[PDB]
């Protein structure tokens, strides 16, 4: 259910032009990050390259990797725009389209994941794994690039999120800080959770194993979910049990 | 119960001079970070600017902003001094006044919050939100700048701390790593906790909603607090219940 | 049960030469990080120096400190090699010896701890504490340098790990994201856990106090362990109780 | 008399692959500068961006500008290849096609001039003048972007070269360190020299005013040329007079 | 004959605002370098700090020093404004007040000299000599900070300019690239030239010893001046002799 | 005739300890550049690595190259100390042993040349040529690494110095800014000057061809020397003729 990419971009530029006027200390930042770019794809590649840069691998090098991915699969940029909207609609602290793009590390991590996922599915595993782990240090989100994640995702606050190799996260999911989608121990093969559409996961929840969390479900903060959660229910506790409906 | 600013500074400088002599590898660091500065405010702005610097906004620009805030509200520097003492008095590993200022990302994150809170209350929201989110990536602490936080606060270890827009933290509070002061929903308006004076919050505790944690209470590690906690009580478990007295 | 250092290194170079051919965008990274170095110690000091570098302390300065430590206690490099193997044998996502060394922040943090532990035991506490806290910001692991940690350790994902001053972690232990090995409150002296050989600690587990976790035990994700756990037992829940055996 | 671009590039990659094997310390440099790039244009934009980067304008931003220029006028890349050959054929110290491209600041400055000249002729004077003056600090060559400069040029050693706004330098010219192509004083309009094809200019020669230096002439080191020099003549002295023929 | 500081600044800001609109690629640069600053002094300190920054001493540290000098002697900022006008009025390529301030290393070197001269006259010689020599590597101009230099000075192109300890340069002087105001020996005491008001010095001129160059004189490019030059005379050649009148 | 290396080092450290006390703004710089190092070799490698660092090749990488050269030929460090003394004795503006080491780009260029010369004579031509050209951009001195240069050399001011492949510079030579020791045109084989012991070369002199400048001779500023200069004479003019004795 996402608004048009080109429409979110225009909104973003309009907000930024206006914001640059009312805060002179950030005008340079708004121009470099948003206003000089012709499209959302180019602003995204610039941002990720600058934020992921290190002595190990410079921004100029990261950018050409991201630009190649976006040139080959421009739907990733459309997913970014859907992710921007997800935050704006769901987070009461965020009114502007430009806010997630500019500032939120969960959003940034989610878009870096898309690049890593594109690389991994092309067999460019080394580069995907390089990026995954540079994202873990820079944005404190560790998503394996083989995980299958949809669009309209919000990674709220985001610090300490861990998502495993064989996880699936469907559209419109909201995930808070310190959520693990992980295994049951020294396990192998299909071993990580399947999070269905519209699920919200509270802070510090651990969802472990190849188990379903059904569509529209709510996972309580600090839960340890070891069995499947039916659609449209609230699961909570250690271990998690059904405590209501959302 | 907080001693004078000029006095902690003199102590800090005394410690640094002596430390520079016994560790030649750190002498340059002690001089740049502390000894060439004429006051704590100057040392704080330098440190925050250096640690928050990135490709997207340099140390030289961040320092200007911090210096402006400290010039307009120098009580923020007095709060920093109380925060240094808090760590020295409560953390048994730390015995020197210079230690929180030099090394501890919780202390730095708390002082960065103060600048953001000053900016936010001046209507300079873009800059406060920029700082909040750079603090999140740099020190792994995500405090909304509209949160109202007192002095004599310890953020022990600090990684993964998240504090919401409408939270309150009174004086002399101690918070550990991975503590969330968050919402219950999908919530709007006044929706985050009220942590009263002298409260201690254990590692990984989630305190959710507009609920009081009474003064002198102890929140257990890994707790999920969903109802108010009376003063001078120990609350623990998922969900939290009264388990005793400090 | 460790493969010899020199064999690990030879395999590392073999993998990297082959990987550099199949991914041109990372060839420079592989040559700088691995292929130009004559031994594992050289590569580790270069990597740690580059990854911990900041405005307050440059790579060139950090490298000198790490090289000194490795010259005085070369067994730290053998511990690194055991740690590489640990990840390779236990993590189904990792097949190559080069992977932990190149990418995993848990591995990097563990090797940085070794340098800090060496400095701390030489009485060079300032420098040990500088490194501890730079590792906290860069890799999001906070290990006090006085903690005693063996070899064959895996810090899986690693973000939010906190280990206290008087903790002990024996050989072949596996620790996940957001694990605290901490105290029970306003405590002093021997106050942190003793983790025995082959223990596995799930995501977000808090182990509090000077309590033992016995040989080969398994701590559940999200547990709050307040009493000792007997060997070869699975403990879980808030608070943790015995739920089975691995 | 220029070898084709694609043949130059193929030779460049061949040399670099071989050189990377025989010097491990530079393998990373060769892969980043040359071997990861699909064509000479890509390598030139990367090199210019990295070498001109500063706090005021990063590599990532400079690269976009250079890539745009090269996309709109790919003949600039063919001029670069002619310039590489010029140095290789004329400089007895240089045997490899890769050498000018990798190391020589005169070559780099010449290619930066081309980008500036392209911007200047598009009316993008601010950006042309930014580049001119960044080239002056980085490579110590100050060429006004309105100067008209051909191909097969060698700027040997290059430091202190100054070329004025209305200068012309035809094909196959060789210029040494500290050469000024300048005016006669407080002047205006067409006021700088016209250097014709195959001219050789010695170290420290000043050529002043809108005067011609004819085809195949030789200007002596330390000369002050104030009148025109006929073709195929050697001019030298202060002021310069005819002393022979090359 | 030098117009007001507040007026040149207002012009500079007017130019920058307009220029930012017609070149989106430089808008960030215009905002960081000029538009976010409240006065010329602030813009100058920022620029000098950014351009002189290096591994050995960061922008944030250099800015403090420059700000202290400008606070103690704000006439240095008025001299900068006269120097901007000098270039605008004398260099036919330059028509905007913002151009010398933004781009011209001769202008920057001259303003860095003023800070060094202030430091030197305060007995802070180490810092003046540090700055002199960082200016030499960054802007390729080497002025001893004890040299006495007036205002309305143009250092045109500027590369390789060298001015000695006991030199004097009065108001309204124009100096080109590779000009040396040096000694004759193996000399001691008062040993460098006295350049009087309105003198013009051509490219590569060497003026050696404690000799006068009289007011309004013109020194020819490539000259070696060893005896005094009377006012309003043109001196040229090796060695220099009187050749006419301006 | 050089003082002992170990004696100059002690002097250097004594000066620096004292200077760090009287200038707090530079204490960090004195500690990082001099006071933390155990010997002159280690301070030199640190300095050259920091000053030559770029996006292209980091300080950490440059340092290991310089350390290897110094470990294999420690006489290079003794030549450095002789060079420090040369400046102190010959330059009236320099009293302290620490001054050349800290600040003078000519001294730095001379020591980088020694590293390049060591590499070139080991057949490591690529790395020697990398360094030569990084020195040309950073210190504005371009010395071919095959040139044979003695000790007790002063490169005064140094900007624009160019020395060719087959040049020789004997002990105790003084060379000023913009001196070229170059060829006669498109020449080959032994083609650059032979500068004998104790020669001083004035600013902007061009000495061209395989010609001798005899011991103790003085070359005038701005001369063009095309024929041999007998020992103990002063040569000057364009072209140079014998004008006296020193
Ligand atoms: C024991 C019940 C714990 C309940 O946790 C939540 O209801 C909860 C709170 C939130 O802020 C969420 O975002 C969430 O998904 C669940
Ligand atoms: C299940 C009983 C709760 C256990 O957690 C604590 O007692 C606790 C609380 C705190 O605020 C701490 O700082 C702590 O170290 C332990
Ligand atoms: C019984 C409630 C939670 C149990 O959690 C686990 O079984 C667990 C423990 C571990 O050490 C793991 O690595 C894991 O993935 C799950
Ligand atoms: C007759 C006085 C100086 C002559 O200088 C040269 O012959 C000269 C000219 C050039 O173009 C060169 O490249 C050179 O090396 C010498
Ligand atoms: C040999 C006659 C001297 C030639 O040099 C100049 O006339 C000259 C002097 C200057 O001060 C200039 O700025 C210039 O462009 C030419
Ligand atoms: C025409 C005579 C020119 C004389 O140039 C010099 O005497 C001279 C001056 C200096 O400062 C030097 O260092 C030098 O070697 C020569």
Vertex D162: Cα angle to D160 and D164 (nearest 5): 175
> Looking at residue D27, what DSSP letter applies?
H
Encoding tokens for residue F169?
Answer: 């510079």
User: For residue C106, what are the contacts with CB-CB under 8 A and spacing of at least 6?
Assistant: C139, C141, C154, C155, C156, C157, C158, C161
- No. of H helices and E strands in chain E? 8, 15
Question: Which candidate in A94, A222, A243 is best for mutational testing of the B interface (most B CBs within 10 A)?
Answer: A222
Locate tokens 């987070």: which residue?
A91
Can you give the CATH number for the domain in which E34 is found? 1.10.3130.10
Residues A193 and A75 in one domain: no
Q: Are D150 and D2 in contact (CB under 8 A)?
A: no
Residue E120 lies in a domain: yes
Biggest CA pair distance of chain F? 55
Domain boundary among the residues B141, B170, B204 is at B141
Residues B116 and B180 in one domain: no
Binary contact (E223, D204; C-beta < 8 A): no
Q: How far apart are alpha carbons F170 and F161 in whole angstroms? A: 16
Report CA-CA distances (Å) from D37 to A147, C26, D16, D205, E195. 30, 12, 12, 38, 53
Pocket of ligand 6 (CB under 6 A): E 182-184, 208, 224, 238-239; F 176, 200-202, 218-221, 236-237, 243
Residues A38 and A90 in one domain: yes
What's the domain count of chain E? 2
Question: If you measure CA to CA, which chain C residue comes closest to D32?
Answer: C28
> Looking at residue A146, what DSSP letter applies?
T
**Residue from E165, E184, E205 to probe ligand 6 pocket by mutation (most atoms less than 8 Å from CB):** E184
Residue D104 lies in a domain: yes
Looking at the complex, report in whole angstroms how far the Cα of residue D46 sits from the nearest Cα belonging to chain A.
8
Burial class (CB within 10 angstroms; exposed 0-12, middle 13-18, buried 19+) of A146:
buried
Buried/exposed code over B213-241 (b: 16+ C-beta within 10 A; e: otherwise): bbbbbbbbbbbbbbebbeeebbbbbbbbe
Q: How many CB atoms lie within 10 A of CB E188?
A: 10
Encoding tokens for residue A65?
Answer: 């990797």
Question: If you measure CA to CA, which chain F residue comes closest to B33?
Answer: F28
Q: DSSP letters along A73-130, please?
A: -THHHHHHHHHHHHHHHH-TT---THHHHHH-HHHHHHHHHHHHHHHHHTT-HHHHHH
> Considering every ligand atom, which ligand is closest to the CA of A184?
3
Looking at the complex, report in whole angstroms how far the Cα of residue C81 sits from the nearest Cα belonging to chain D.
23
* Residues in chain E closer than 8 A to F22 (CB atoms): 126
Backbone angles phi, psi at A150, to 5 degrees: -85, -155
Chains with ≥3 Cβ pairs under 8 A against A?
A: B, C, D, E
Residues D184 and D129 in one domain: no
Locate tokens 């909603």: which residue?
B209
The residue nearest atom 10 of ligand 2, judged by CA position, is B202
Residue A146 lies in a domain: no
Q: Are E167 and E195 in contact (CB under 8 A)?
A: yes
Q: How far apart are alpha carbons C132 and C111 in whole angstroms? A: 11
Residues B135 and B180 in one domain: no
Residues F14 and F125 in one domain: yes
Residues C4 and C81 in one domain: yes
* Residues in chain F closer than 8 A to D176 (CB atoms): 180, 182
Question: If you measure CA to CA, which chain D residue comes closest to C38?
Answer: D24
DSSP, collapsed to helix, strand or coil, labels residue E29 as helix
Residue C148 lies in a domain: no
Buried/exposed code over B171-200 (b: 16+ C-beta within 10 A; e: otherwise): bbbbbbbbbbbbbeeebeeebbbbbbbbbb
Q: How many CB atoms lie within 10 A of CB C62?
A: 26
Chains with ≥3 Cβ pairs under 8 A against E?
A: A, B, D, F
Residues F125 and F204 in one domain: no
Cα of E184 to ligand 6 centre, how many Å?
A: 5
Q: Are C134 and C52 in contact (CB under 8 A)?
A: yes
> Considering every ligand atom, which ligand is closest to the CA of F216?
6
- Give all strands of the β-sheet with A194-195 in edge-to-edge order: A148-149, A168-169, A194-195, A212-213
Residue F148 lies in a domain: no
Residue B107 lies in a domain: yes
Residue D150 lies in a domain: no
Buried/exposed code over D224-246 (b: 16+ C-beta within 10 A; e: otherwise): bbbebbeeebbbbbbbbeeeeee
Q: How far apart are alpha carbons B99 and B142 in whole angstroms? A: 22
* Residues in chain E closer than 8 A to B126 (CB atoms): none
Cα of E224 to ligand 6 centre, how many Å?
A: 9
Which residues make beta-bridge pairs with C200? C174, C218
Report CA-CA distances (Å) from B234 to B180, B213, C187. 18, 10, 16
Residues F2 and F94 in one domain: yes
Residue F152 lies in a domain: no
Q: How far apart are alpha carbons C209 and C184 in whole angstroms? A: 5
Domain boundary among the residues A107, A140, A173 is at A140
Question: Which chain D residues have any C-beta within 8 angstroms of a chain F C-beta?
Answer: 19, 22-23, 25-26, 28-29, 32-33, 50-51, 53, 59, 90, 92-93, 99, 102-105, 138-140, 157-160, 176-178, 200, 202-204, 218, 220-223, 236-238, 246
> Looking at residue C171, what DSSP letter applies?
T
F141 closest CA partner among F119, F123, F158:
F158
Pocket of ligand 4 (CB under 6 A): D 176, 200-202, 218-221, 236, 243; F 182-185, 208, 224, 226, 239
Q: Decide the pairing of beta strands F241-244 and C180-182.
A: unpaired
Atom of ligand 2 nearest to the CA of C183: 15
Q: Are D138 and F137 in contact (CB under 8 A)?
A: yes
> Looking at residue F87, what DSSP letter applies?
H
Encoding tokens for residue A84?
Answer: 């921007």
Can you give the CATH number for the domain in which D176 is found? 2.160.10.10
Backbone angles phi, psi at F150, to 5 degrees: -85, -155
Q: How far apart are alpha carbons F180 and D133 in whole angstroms? A: 25
Locate tokens 């170095």: which residue?
C37
Locate tokens 């004398």: which residue?
E90
* Residues in chain E closer than 8 A to D133 (CB atoms): 103-105
Q: Which long-range contacts (CB under 8 A, 24 or more apart) does E119-123 make?
A: E119/E65, E119/E69, E119/E145, E120/E145, E120/E146
Q: Decide the pairing of beta strands C161-163 and C141-143.
A: parallel
Cα of A220 to ligand 1 centre, how many Å?
A: 4
The residue nearest atom 14 of ligand 1, judged by CA position, is A202
Method: X-ray
Binary contact (F177, E188; C-beta < 8 A): no
Burial class (CB within 10 angstroms; exposed 0-12, middle 13-18, buried 19+) of F189:
exposed
Question: If you measure CA to CA, which chain B residue comes closest to F23?
Answer: B36
Q: How far is CA D31 from the centre of its chain?
A: 24
Estimate the share of chain C in helix, then strand, then coil, as percent rounded to the nearest 5.
45, 15, 40
Domain boundary among the residues E78, E113, E142 is at E142
Residues F79 and F115 in one domain: yes
- No. of H helices and E strands in chain F? 8, 15
Question: Which candidate in F19, F27, F43, F50 is best for mutational testing of the B interface (most B CBs within 10 A)?
Answer: F27
Encoding tokens for residue D98?
Answer: 């890769």
Q: For ligand 1, is residue A41 a contact (CB within 6 Å)? A: no
Resolution in A: 1.8
Report CA-CA distances (Å) from B131 to A26, A88, B117, B182. 11, 19, 10, 20
Binding residues of E for CoA: 177, 183-184, 186, 203, 221, 234
Query: Residue D48 sits in which domain range?
Result: 1-141
Cα of F227 to ligand 4 centre, how many Å?
A: 12
Looking at the complex, report in whole angstroms how far the Cα of residue C243 sits from the nearest Cα belonging to chain B.
18
Residues C21 and C128 in one domain: yes
Q: Are D166 and D190 in contact (CB under 8 A)?
A: yes
Vertex B173: Cα angle to B169 and B178 (nearest 5): 85
Binding residues of D: 177, 183-184, 186, 203, 221, 234
Q: How far apart are alpha carbons F56 and D53 in whole angstroms? A: 11
End-to-end C-alpha distance for chain F, whole angstroms = 21
Question: If you measure CA to CA, which chain E residue comes closest to F33?
Answer: E56
Q: Are A17 and E6 in contact (CB under 8 A)?
A: no
Question: Which chain B residues have any C-beta within 8 angstroms of a chain F C-beta?
Answer: 20, 24-25, 27-29, 31-32, 35-36
Is F132 annotated as ligand-binding? no
Q: How far apart are alpha carbons E47 and E84 in whole angstroms? A: 15
A168 closest CA partner among A194, A142, A191:
A194
Encoding tokens for residue F25?
Answer: 């703004």
The residue nearest atom 5 of ligand 1, judged by CA position, is A220
Q: How far apart are alpha carbons A126 and A109 in whole angstroms? A: 18
Residues F170 and F120 in one domain: no
Question: If you measure CA to CA, which chain B residue comes closest to F38?
Answer: B24
* Residues in chain D closer than 8 A to F202 (CB atoms): none
Q: Are D110 and D81 in contact (CB under 8 A)?
A: no
Cα of D223 to ligand 4 centre, how many Å?
A: 9
Which residues make beta-bridge pairs with A181? A163, A207
């Amino acid at each position: 259910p996402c608004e048009e990419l080109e429409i979110v971009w225009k909104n973003i530029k309009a907000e930024a032009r206006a914001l640059a006027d009312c805060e002179p200390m950030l005008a340079s930042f708004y121009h470099a990050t948003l206003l000089k770019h012709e499209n959302l794809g180019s602003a995204l590649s610039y941002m990720l390259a600058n934020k992921l840069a290190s002595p190990i691998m410079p921004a100029i090098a990261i950018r050409e990797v991201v630009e190649e991915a976006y040139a080959a699969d421009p739907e990733m940029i459309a997913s970014a725009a859907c992710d921007i909207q997800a935050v704006r609609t769901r987070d009461p602290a965020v009114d502007k389209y430009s806010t997630p793009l500019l500032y939120l590390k969960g959003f940034h991590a989610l878009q870096a994941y898309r690049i890593g996922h594109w690389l991994w599915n092309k067999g460019r595993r080394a580069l995907a794994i390089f990026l995954q782990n540079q994202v873990s240090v820079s944005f404190q989100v560790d998503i394996h690039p083989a995980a299958k994640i949809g669009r309209g995702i919000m990674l709220d606050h985001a610090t300490g999120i861990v998502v495993g190799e064989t996880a699936v996260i469907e559209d419109d999911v909201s995930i808070l800080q310190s959520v693990t989608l992980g295994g049951t121990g020294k396990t192998s093969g299909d071993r990580h959770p399947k999070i269905r559409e519209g699920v919200m996961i509270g802070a510090g929840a651990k969802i472990l194993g190849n188990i379903e969390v059904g569509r529209g479900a709510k996972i309580g903060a600090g839960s340890v979910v070891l069995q499947p959660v039916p659609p449209h229910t609230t699961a909570a506790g250690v271990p998690a049990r059904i405590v209501g409906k959302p």
